[PDB]
DNA sequence: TCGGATGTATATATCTGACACGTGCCTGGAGACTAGGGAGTAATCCCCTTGGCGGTTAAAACGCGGGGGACAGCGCGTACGTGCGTTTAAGCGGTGCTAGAGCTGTCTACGACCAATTGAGCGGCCTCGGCACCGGGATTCTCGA
DNA sequence: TCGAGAATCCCGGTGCCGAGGCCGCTCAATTGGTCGTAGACAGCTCTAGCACCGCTTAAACGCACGTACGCGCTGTCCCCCGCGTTTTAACCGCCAAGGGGATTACTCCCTAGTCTCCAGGCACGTGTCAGATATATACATCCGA
């Protein structure tokens, strides 16, 4: 299953994640395909700020989901 | 002296089963006792209310299952009903 | 006994007596206490496992209310179940607003 | 030397929010509880555990209200909390008339 | 008496919440809200111990009063 | 060509709808939405009309209360127009999950 | 018969009127989507509770009284339909 | 089938209070629901208090304490005065 | 005086309340003084609400009572409003309040 | 500040469908009496709460330099209110029809009580190892340059 | 950007008291069994939810146009914050006393339960006026020269 994340720049990038995939792994994926360190990556889905460590199946993020991202310098 | 009753031994057995080498404090025992009592009170009250609500004077497995589906959230509700029905069928298999 | 037949830890007889004497209903069936005990044992086992993992994280061997509070407030569903409740000697989760952080 | 404002404040934030002990002095709280209970009845006697429980509940309620006030204050594009934030939080919570 | 809640104490209590700066009237505002909260809680507890026909306030009465307002507490046998 | 200044007609509508007492959302789209929502949980469910009416009344009350709290938050923020962030803030402070 | 894309039934003027009853004066052009989402989640919760209640009843029709029970459970009881 | 309600009693109370005022059906249903809700609340609170105090019988005292608990100050005072007057009137004869 | 309600000079019934209390599984045994007290409290509350509603209806030059009058009476009294702080009334409406700053200058 | 166009509150006929009232009856409530278990009353004991005194020291209180933050004023370019014309689906009025809610009789398996029995669970003791406290050293930001 | 100084975390050593285990004992959980009734089932009966067809029109959608409001930039003035010194009362540690909570034993009286009889309230039915619709008019209010 794949979702999408858009930043404030309007660019939406596909993320190939899994229910067992964690926020640490997804931010590693953003590091791999965008280069942005996770310490600037801040993300909202359904108005909730996720921590690092949980799983997507815990929050049951459905497929084709679009997340909102900013870079906190 | 008053013979006060608690759930210390049973939760101790459960803790030993799930974790071999782990200790516990007295405040944790009080907290677990209170939590168990609260959950039991909630479930029993809801089940009794529903049983007398659908014109019946008998409380069985069914209204307890319905209450477990009601108060408990989804995934844990499914796990709870699975565990409960497994226990019931295991008990009724023997005699 | 009766808890031995179902392969459970919690006592069936105590639950049965509490249900009967708590005037919840005029009469009670023979299948209720087993189900209730199984559900209670599942919930307490989940809570104890989370608390034990949290305690093992901090290089300790005993469980104190802080570990229970952390385990309860970390799991989403367990947090939403015990929403309007408070735990003595618990504390708060380590959160700081992003804006408040220095430039 | 000197420390710029806002640093030791964060230090205290981390230190206090890491710990799990109470902050209000016991004796003034007991005196206030006894005096406020004098109105409904005189010559009342209190067990210590009751006072401890009251203190714990009051501290938890105050901390929750302060967190909500801070959230409202940052939403209003400010850094310092003000009494209007307190009243707005109490009103939205649905407790104040 | 009521002014016994020191300014540093309430400052620390707020600091646990996670607030950086503090203005002048917050101390009085929290004193008032604490007064209201305590008034309600020990009024309910006093009523309970009145019906109990006893001259001592027990922690169980406080636990029951806290529960009756949807603010139940764990760790004192209730 | 008469041109009222902005906000006057808004005041007129505010007063008119506050004075009245009947519901506002049309019936058939609400019934269709309720049936479609209930389709997922269980198939071939038949609904009584009074149940749909009760659902509409409850939704009306909830939405009115939420909009009132949103307006309170918006006027607190030193603005005149409500924004989604006000809705999220009100939902968060109320104690319901956002 | 399959039903889909019914959430658009709640039109923009209806939401504007609902806000106007509350007392709002000026409306931004983006609140409609989150209003629809909030209505959707509220309806989902209430409908699920009512469906469970009628499922225990061993029937195939949902009455308003079950809706009243479900509304009462969430601490938002309602007067005007009996019970 | 019989459908029990509190219609005639509410009508009698309304006639006693106001002499020339009528009532509609929806308002009567609202009053019936309100009366049922208040009765349920008071009875449940009284039963819980009686079980807390380790007693096996419900009397006037626990009802009075429940009224003091739920209802606000002046309302509780007026209600308890009316209740004690009614009970002493009943027990006089 | 045959009926129990006539004995205490009350309008609400006594036997119905007693039977509902007995069959409501609230307690193992019930006394002989609970129903009269409960009926008196219920009658007082109903009389208060009804007189408020009647005054509100008279204020609008009408004769019959409609749920809007009940909503106005309930929400215009502080203690009664606090008693029903989490209750929604059908067709009641809202209170006509406008924020001061929204008004034109 | 004014005046015309607009919207709103007021007066009046009228016709209708919801509301107050008369009637029969039947099912729940009241009169009468029992019988026993639950509650009220009276001693008695001893455990926990109140009270008070000495110290010590950590916390509280008061004053001062100052840089960062709340608040007001100005400019602008856009996002939404308003009016108009066009399209379209909601609402109303009958018409069919069948799935299913609701009530009735049966007979049957399931749950309460009671008498004999025992071992699982609770109270008291102990002992020792996990945790608290203190001295010492390594690391890392954090403000100045 | 590069410099140092407290602040903080990690490590080792030492001491202490709460938890885990053990032993003795009394009461609540088993067990074999009878008897009454709660309800699962079969049936049947009438009601209301669903599908639909046609007509009407008030409501919905899209567009032009204009303005006032959210937002960024600038400045000022002032007020909490971080240190440093002086003042005090909290807490510990201990010692004394008693009165109120917890328990036991005795007695009496209040209510569940049963029977018989009867009238209070409910379903059914009907006349009728309070209020919504429609109409017409005078008063209040809003934009602009």
Numbering used by the authors:
A (entry chain K): 1 to 73
B (entry chain D): 28 to 122
C (entry chain C): 16 to 118
D (entry chain E): 39 to 135
E (entry chain F): 25 to 102
F (entry chain A): 38 to 135
G (entry chain B): 20 to 102
H (entry chain H): 29 to 121
What does the primary publication say about this deposited structure?
The nucleosome is the fundamental organizational unit of chromatin and comprises two copies each of histones H2A, H2B, H3, and H4 wrapped by ∼147 base pairs (bp) of DNA. The nucleosome contains a conserved cluster of negatively charged residues in histones H2A and H2B, known as the nucleosome acidic patch, that is a hotspot for interactions with proteins that regulate transcription, the cell cycle, and the DNA damage response. Monoubiquitination of histones H2B-K120 (H2BK120ub) and H2A-K119 (H2AK119ub) play opposing roles in transcription regulation and chromatin compaction. Our results suggest a mechanism by which H2BK120ub serves as a gatekeeper to the acidic patch and point to distinct roles for histone H2AK119 and H2BK120 ubiquitination in regulating protein binding to nucleosomes.
To see whether ubiquitin conjugated to H2A-K119 adopts discrete positions, we determined cryoEM structures of the nucleosome core particle containing ubiquitinated histone H2A-K119 and Widom 601 DNA (147 bp). The cryoEM dataset revealed two distinct ubiquitin positions, denoted H2Aub positions 1 and 2, with global resolution estimates for the corresponding EM maps of 3.41 and 3.47 Å, respectively. The ubiquitin in H2Aub position 1 binds to the nucleosome surface over histones H3 and H4, immediately adjacent to the acidic patch. In this position, ubiquitin partially overlaps the acidic patch, with an occluded surface area of 480 Å2 as measured with a 5 Å probe radius. Since heterochromatic regions are characterized by chromatin that is condensed and enriched in H2AK119ub, we explored whether the ubiquitin in H2Aub position 1 could be accommodated within higher-order nucleosome packing. Modeling using the structure of a compacted tetranucleosome shows that the ubiquitin in H2Aub position 1 can be readily accommodated between two stacked nucleosomes without steric clash. Ubiquitin in this position can also accommodate binding of the linker histone H1, which binds to the nucleosome dyad, promotes chromatin condensation and is abundant in heterochromatic regions. By contrast, cryoEM maps of H2AK119ub nucleosomes revealed only one stable ubiquitin position on the face of the nucleosome, which only partly overlaps the H2A/H2B acidic patch. The KD of RCC1 for nucleosomes containing H2AK119ub was measured by SPR to be 540 ± 90 nM, similar to the KD of RCC1 for unmodified nucleosomes. These results indicate that ubiquitin conjugated to H2AK119 does not interfere with RCC1 binding to the nucleosome, consistent with our cryoEM data showing that ubiquitin in H2AK119ub nucleosomes only partly occludes the nucleosome acidic patch.
